[PDB]
Symmetry: D2
Subunit: 239 residues, 4 copies
């Protein structure tokens, strides 16, 4: 399919429900050779099994909180893919207390720091560590959400981290474009209705197919873009 | 390819340089069966020849200035495609005096009326006339430009017509979504550099591949969206 | 007041409830000398009544559907004010059956034409006709609505006209800026209470106060801008 | 003046050139009683000098990197003002080598952390610490830049921090709105002349005038908004 010839690193697979699992399935279906990271010992086996099902045995530890963990992961990847064609960043975190109740009362310096570090800084952290490894025609992809652009109850400091992430997409697109690298985001709708134009929530298949496109040469003209894959939800009001 | 099974009507082919020609080529490459309209007697032969080269002999007259011309075209199409899966609207016009010099001095009531009528109203005019003919899963596509969002010298009243067109995308997406129809726009970069992140202007191949995606089931999650296919130009400043 | 020494023409006063009324009130409070237009003879007396209360006896007929009516209004105005400091455009119209039900079904070529002509073209028609009369430091103001940016049920074709209007703000600002004229819009909330950050609907006073600022030299740094005066409604979601 | 009866805290006065200075001046002109903070002992005298000229002897140390410093500042302030009417946040910082050259190369985890903590988290840190002190009708104001929305060379990680900041405006506006507090930002132009619609760079006076409006009850209808005070620069392209 339209990704044949392409080697893509997929982060953030934690289950069959993971957006990153929808994405990996779509990309494998389209001929991509895939590699996988897992955060910790808890997730290793699950990811190894998913990776084997998608014809891959590149399954590498990466905790994006640590610069050393990222560098080590890309050194391991280089033994088998001295060059590759980009990555899917489907990662973020905020401490649980951050994401419930009044935003101003919930947010703390430490919660803000972690949300921004894991959910925004890590995208460019990965880009920096693998920069010389990317072929011309490479594409990077991250996942965002409408809370970056609107104040959504409870989403709280993650809205700010996502806004930071979307700016990071633009700054990265601008920096790496001259070396033949594109950088985009998908702003996905919430994954499981009456107010969405298409009258349903998007599925990880929808998200996956858009992701496959944005990482393929089919999207050669698209960079620094946040594409809304939310069924039109964000463009409607008072439906 | 990813458009097999799909019947798409393509408007706006006037030459090999036409965006709509890039789009038709991409879609044919991906397995779509195509139909074509031509504005007038001058363009008929060129379009017939392009259509034959892309395995089609559905070549129908349509001048979107006239409600009768549109209805007649869709009656002719119905004899051969009683149902189809959407259309590509790659059409607009403003009188030549509109598009040069100071916007306020150039614009006239009549120029504004024509620019908006041909370049914005015609998208929904076509949708209205073929509404009952569209299958569930249908996609409509139009072409826009950054002048809808920024004031660009000389682009003048067409900027306003394009802003109207982009709103029309949202309103149409919202109206037709419940019947299984998606509606998007591509905001293409100018087609033939130092300031664009990807360091080149997009080509009708870039535009065509994005268009093929947006009219395919691969983009099932995307509606009422204006996707920038301009190489990142609009997201950079002072480059 | 912060409008002392300013002469501002105000269109669209139709009653004591009109947004244009709240605007005229706030401007008069702030030291502006005002002039008023009215659409037809049906409203001549009533508008003379309002102008009276606001220190004005400059009351002129103007139907923005006609170039000759606009021209003759500014000629009359020129007899009292050979120079003045800008105007407020608070005018718009679509035929009634445009504004009910499914957009794609309701919209017609003629309904589209009128909505755009009266609600968008008229803004620049007015600027063209008084361009040579404007002092340096002049400001033009129009009134938009969130329907320009989002698909709102029943707002239908007015959404497109308002999008054309906001583009018109940008193109006008760009063209007239160099001779010292600013051009802006206010996107007002409806005159919703439950989901607005400020937990109330805005008033003609809130709107009038922002209008007065945007036509004064206090807003000297602001041009080409759509200022949302809707209590934050448009930046919130799922409240 | 239109700020009579208001008590507003102003951060970020570092010299007579500071945007915060132009803001304090405009507010004092309009009848506001002011208080000032300063970052370190290096600036204590100089800021007392400015406060003096602006009818104020409320001058308090505050380093926004520390929760205890913010807490102790608002405790001191509480002795003169048990209640007040909001504050201006005109504070931000990235280590210097963050702001030069290719973004992906310059950015580090620590540089990112600091930029976001000082330029974005501090805004909400301040709101949290004085939340119970704010009168109904209070307004908070921060200062952003177009780098939040576009990739600007060398602005680098500050672009992400400002995007986080503008999201913070929205989330703060949403959370504090119901108790009668508004929150907005001004995105100021640089303090370019050739491509700005108004053909000049904006001044600390233009900025100060818009700031004064946005902290006054005149802007009662405006919350959650980023107001561009850049002479229209961001709405123009290819000028
Ligand atoms: N879901 C939905 O709806 C959505 C989502 N979004 C986004 O995307 C992404 C992804 O997610 P998901 O797939 O869903 O989830 P999960 O599966 O859980 O995943 C995550 C991941 O990450 C990782 N990590 C963490 N931390 C870390 C990591 N790695 C490495 N290192 C470190 N340190 C784990 O492991 C996993 O795998 C995301 O980003 C999202 O976002 B959010 O915010 C959201 C959600 C939901 C909704 C909305 C939003 C969730 N979550 N999140 C986060 N996490 S941040 C988008 C849209 C939609
Ligand atoms: N090019 C570029 O760069 C671009 C473009 N854009 C858009 O898209 C569209 C399409 O275009 P093109 O392809 O390029 O061109 P042509 O070829 O010429 O085509 C057109 C068409 O249309 C038609 N018509 C007209 N009128 C009519 C018709 N049909 C029917 N009926 C009627 N009445 C003809 O025939 C032809 O075929 C468009 O839309 C565009 O836009 B614009 O504005 C632009 C340009 C350039 C640049 C920019 C923009 C051109 N043109 N235009 C118009 N026309 S409106 C987008 C982006 C880019
Ligand atoms: N309301 C609300 O909420 C709003 C509104 N907006 C806008 O603003 C403007 C103004 O309106 P109002 O004030 O509201 O109302 P009125 O009083 O009725 O006014 C109107 C005016 O106009 C004029 N005209 C007409 N036609 C014509 C004229 N002139 C001349 N010529 C001609 N042809 C009359 O007379 C009067 O005075 C407007 O623009 C508005 O918009 B809309 O769309 C809307 C509404 C509602 C809501 C939303 C929107 C209503 N209406 N509209 C129209 N009409 S266009 C804004 C915001 C809000
Ligand atoms: N300039 C211009 O053009 C602009 C600006 N913007 C903004 O605003 C603000 C303020 O700034 P300015 O006034 O300009 O400056 P200054 O005077 O130097 O100020 C600063 C301040 O802060 C403070 N701090 C620091 N650190 C700290 C503090 N406090 C406390 N704690 C701590 N740790 C000091 O002391 C002073 O006072 C800002 O925010 C700005 O932003 B940015 O970014 C920018 C610039 C330029 C341009 C653009 C942007 C500069 N800078 N920056 C910073 N820093 S962040 C806006 C617009 C415009």
């Amino acid at each position: 399919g339209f990704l044949s010839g392409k080697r893509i690193l997929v982060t953030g697979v934690a289950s069959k429900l993971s957006i990153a699992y929808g994405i990996a399935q779509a990309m494998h279906r389209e001929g991509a050779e895939l590699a996988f990271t897992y955060q910790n010992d808890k997730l290793k086996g699950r990811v190894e099994e998913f990776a084997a099902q998608l014809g891959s045995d590149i399954v590498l530890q990466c905790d994006v909180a640590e610069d050393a963990s990222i560098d080590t992961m890309f050194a391991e990847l280089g033994k088998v893919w001295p060059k590759f064609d980009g990555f899917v960043h489907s990662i973020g975190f905020a401490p649980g207390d951050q994401l419930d109740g009044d935003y101003v009362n919930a947010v703390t310096r430490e919660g803000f720091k972690i949300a921004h570090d894991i959910s925004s800084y890590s995208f460019v952290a990965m880009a920096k560590a693998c920069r010389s490894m990317l072929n011309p025609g490479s594409a990077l992809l991250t996942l965002s959400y409408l809370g970056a652009e609107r104040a959504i109850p409870n989403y709280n400091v993650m809205g700010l981290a996502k806004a930071s992430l979307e700016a990071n997409v633009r700054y990265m697109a601008n920096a790496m474009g001259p070396e033949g690298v594109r950088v985009n985001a998908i702003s996905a709708g919430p994954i499981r209705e009456a107010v969405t134009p298409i009258r349903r929530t998007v599925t990880i298949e929808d998200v996956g197919n858009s992701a496959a496109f944005l990482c393929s040469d089919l999207s050669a003209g698209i960079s620094g873009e946040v594409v809304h894959v939310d069924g039109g939800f964000s463009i409607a009001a008072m439906n």
